[PDB]
Amino acid sequence: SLVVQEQGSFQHILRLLNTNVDGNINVVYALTTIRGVGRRYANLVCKKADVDLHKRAGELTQEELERIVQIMQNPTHYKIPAWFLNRQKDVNDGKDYHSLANNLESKLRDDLERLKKIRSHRGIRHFWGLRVRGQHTKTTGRRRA
Amino acid sequence: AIISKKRKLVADGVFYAELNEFFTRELAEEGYSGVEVRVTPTKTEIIIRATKVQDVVG
């Protein structure tokens, strides 16, 4: 049922993928805190890592953290399907990457300025900071900042 | 033809309307008054009630 928790071993604050996470959250939802990581993704990564689903973010060992991160950064070797990824294909090089937090903003931005340079309607609209997906704007949003 | 019964009945109704509006359009000068459509296995007879029968007959 319950265990003595092994005082002196439960982590409190962890720094994974140069991002800080709190150890008291369940491992899956804790890993979701990292950008570019959703609940489904974190769950599949965690179960591929053999690390238990019902664990806490402060109770896993360091080698488990290393296993989890190497899984999360190189999915294709670990029978994570060619789909399921954050940026499948990567319209620059054709190899299915999965961007993580800081790389995620860097790449999303660089795509935004690629669209600005491409000077497409998508690009010009993103530059204008309006609704780019072709939605109605006659009565929507009306207020951001 | 191979047509659902409801669709066939609606077709028969719209055919009835066909003839009714036709006769109102044309036979009015001859005194058209009403139409009926009766069907035997052999022929589909159209019975045309009108005021001036002979002019419709011609």
């Binding site: - | 609606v10 009835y16 309307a17």
Partner: protein
């Protein structure tokens, strides 16, 4: 009016693919049971069609 350009565009489908058969209108058309007639044309001819107000 080139024979292959005049009235070139297909009409297999869509709004204009079918007509009222009473007025030739596109708007307010009924396609149920193959009536192919508009709202109000149906509204008065339905009694001769066989329709009657019941509820």
């Amino acid at each position: 009016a080139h024979e292959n350009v005049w009235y070139s565009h297909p009409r297999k489908f869509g709004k204009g693919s079918r007509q009222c058969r009473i007025s030739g209108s596109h708007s307010g058309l009924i396609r149920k049971y193959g009536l192919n007639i508009d709202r109000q044309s149906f509204r008065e001819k339905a009694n001769d069609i066989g329709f009657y107000k019941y509820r």
